[PDB]
Design a binder for this molecule. Structure first.
Ligand code: HEM
Length: 154
């Protein structure tokens, strides 16, 4: 799938709102992810002890993870699909070091969409939601192919 310039503009318009508070969005996205998929929480050794939302919001380590993830994702989105340079190191942190299935990236994308709608409904209507889902689908498609290229089926 291919995004138009106008679609990329909707994605990056929304992403500008994330960049106004990267750490807080990162917290809310990981918390939503861990609440929907506690089996994913178990894969973070430094976070899997966190048993409540209040604990997760207090965790400096969780906040650091959120910033790391959104910083990398933001760099990827700003490439508007021309992101092969960014996907290679990311696949390796994910496809050799650990084994992060594509389905987990799908769950992560669902949490992003949820948090964007929860924090910015007035700037995140149907067109913007579709465009963000399209950009995240392209991310997942291309990281899946990068996985395979490195010898991991995802
Ligand atoms: C449910 C989805 C995901 C899971 C379960 C997951 C899990 C992990 C794990 C276990 C590590 C290495 C553990 C560590 O050394 O701390 C890691 C590294 C990393 N992940 Fe993810 N990840 C997910 C989604 C994402 C997404 C969507 C992005 C960015 C678009 C991302 C960006 C990174 C980066 C940049 C690193 C390297 C961090 C570093 O070098 O310290 N992750 N991920």
């Amino acid at each position: 799938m291919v995004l138009s310039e106008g679609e990329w503009q909707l994605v990056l318009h929304v992403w500008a709102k994330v960049e106004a508070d990267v750490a807080g969005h990162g917290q809310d996205i990981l918390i939503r992810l861990f609440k929907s998929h506690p089996e994913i929480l178990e894969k973070f050794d430094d976070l899997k002890h966190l048993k409540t939302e209040a604990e997760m919001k207090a965790s400096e380590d969780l906040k650091k993870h959120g910033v790391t993830v959104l910083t990398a994702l933001g760099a990827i989105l700003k490439k508007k699909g021309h992101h092969e340079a960014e996907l290679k190191p990311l696949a390796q942190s994910h496809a050799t070091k650990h084994k992060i299935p594509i389905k987990y990236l799908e769950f992560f994308s669902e949490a992003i969409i949820h948090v964007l709608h929860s924090r910015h409904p007035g700037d995140f209507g149907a067109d913007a939601q579709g465009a963000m889902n399209k950009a995240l689908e392209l991310f997942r498609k291309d990281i899946a192919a990068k996985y395979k290229e490195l010898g991991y089926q995802g």
